[PDB]
Amino acid sequence: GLFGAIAGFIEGGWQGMVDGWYGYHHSNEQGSGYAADKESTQKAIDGVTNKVNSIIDKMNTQFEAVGREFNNLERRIENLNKKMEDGFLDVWTYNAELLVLMENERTLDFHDSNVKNLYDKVRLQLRDNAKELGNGCFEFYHKCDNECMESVRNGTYDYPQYS
């Protein structure tokens, strides 16, 4: 993906994280576990919801075929009518299929971006107080208990304390 996180430096997703799209996995002396990041997840849910509705609404008003009858010596206008109706179907079919293709690609990259931004958010808090492993994980120099882990999730990790 464009942002290099999903199937990138983070090789795979977590079957074990069911309460969100993006989040954290901690491991220390007390144990290990998954915690979904509510903020980034809800933002993603809002963005994708709006997108689907935006997509629907734009297509909502679009060409509708009508039945028109022509006799045996009105073949030219019968043909004109057919090409007109077929022509608009092709235009609107193309629009639908292209929009889906383009926006699907943007949706996957949006998720990739959200993971990256969440990763950097943590990286920027920890600074040189942890080893950047290269796989999405940060290994602490100090022992990090469940409260210490919660501060990283908080956005409240006190760098000056553990420096």
């Binding site: 996180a5 977590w14 993006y22 989040g23 901690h26 491991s27 179907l89 993971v115």
Partner: protein, 321 residues
């Protein structure tokens, strides 16, 4: 001790396409294309369609004896007609501006039939012998019930002068016809007068028809032809007929009580005895999808038609193997 950043995976096998990659497995997706229908012709919004079965619009409106089902029809949501209905013009001929009339029906939800010229009223002409073997009813020769085939009485066809004033506060669909005989001998046999005409007048209409004689192939066992004409007679306006021969007089004229959204749907299907809010010639639709791919020509509150086989939006993210 460590903290990791990661993303959701699951057991989903749903795939989506993108520009650069096809069949990308995602954790969540949303199909937006309705692919199914029930396969039946249904009532729309509870309101039953007018199903002509094997009768055509002409057969119904002219009152072909096989279309006795469709005398004084109830109001319809839409109309259903086959591609090649057998019960069309029983007596061979043409229907003038038939397609323009059919188009008018797309704006019409209900007709009420009324008598403008009584059949008994033809005291100076013979009105009960105007039948043919081409339009049979119960094994006996009959004719289009809504119009009267007039012929001479005691070997004399006196000039007809008839006028009807539209006192209803409605537009009125008036139908009439002219008969084209096989030869000069048949012209005299039926109407006696060698040269004949039919003049029809309204505020707008200024018509004068003359019978065209020609040797024609037998259609439905008859080489004679009937050419049918129509008009919309506005309220407070009168229609005037004058003819010395070959006149097919209007007994009944349809009254347009309701003008609404309607359509003449082409389908070989019959009646499912179901209800729907969106109908196609293939069958009815019941879905919340924004799109469908069943059939372009629909009636009612419908999703938009596209030619796609598949429209799936990614909602979730790329799912891991």
């Amino acid at each position: 001790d460590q903290i990791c950043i990661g993303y959701h995976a699951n057991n989903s096998t749903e795939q989506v396409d993108t520009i650069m990659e096809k069949n990308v497995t995602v954790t969540h997706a949303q199909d937006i294309l309705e692919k199914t229908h029930n396969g039946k012709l249904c009532d729309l919004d509870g309101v039953k369609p007018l199903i002509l079965r094997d009768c055509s619009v002409a057969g119904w409106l002219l009152g072909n004896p096989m279309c006795d089902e469709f005398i004084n029809v109830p109001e319809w949501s839409y109309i259903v007609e086959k591609a090649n209905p057998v019960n069309d013009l029983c007596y061979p001929g043409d229907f003038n501006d038939y397609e323009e009339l059919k188009h008018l029906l797309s704006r019409i939800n209900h007709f009420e039939k009324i008598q403008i010229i009584p059949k008994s009223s033809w005291s100076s002409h013979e009105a009960s012998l105007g039948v043919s073997s081409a339009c049979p009813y119960q094994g006996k020769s009959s004719f289009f019930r809504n119009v009267v085939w007039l012929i001479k009485k005691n070997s004399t066809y006196p000039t007809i002068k008839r006028s009807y004033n539209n006192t209803n506060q409605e537009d009125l669909l008036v139908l009439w016809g002219i008969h084209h005989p096989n030869d000069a001998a048949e012209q005299t046999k039926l109407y006696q007068n060698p040269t004949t005409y039919i003049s029809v007048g309204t505020s707008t209409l200024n018509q004068r028809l003359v019978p065209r004689i020609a040797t024609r192939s037998k259609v439905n066992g008859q080489s004679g032809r009937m050419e049918f004409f129509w008009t919309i007679l506005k309220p407070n306006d009168a229609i005037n007929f004058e003819s010395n021969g070959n006149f097919i007089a209007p007994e009944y004229a349809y009254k347009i009580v309701k003008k609404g959204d309607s359509t003449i749907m082409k389908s070989e299907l019959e009646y499912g005895n179901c209800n729907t809010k969106c109908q196609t010639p293939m069958g009815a639709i019941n879905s919340s999808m924004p799109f469908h791919n069943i059939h372009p020509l629909t009636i009612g509150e419908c999703p938009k038609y596209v030619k796609s086989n598949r429209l799936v939006l990614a909602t979730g993210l790329r799912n891991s193997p």
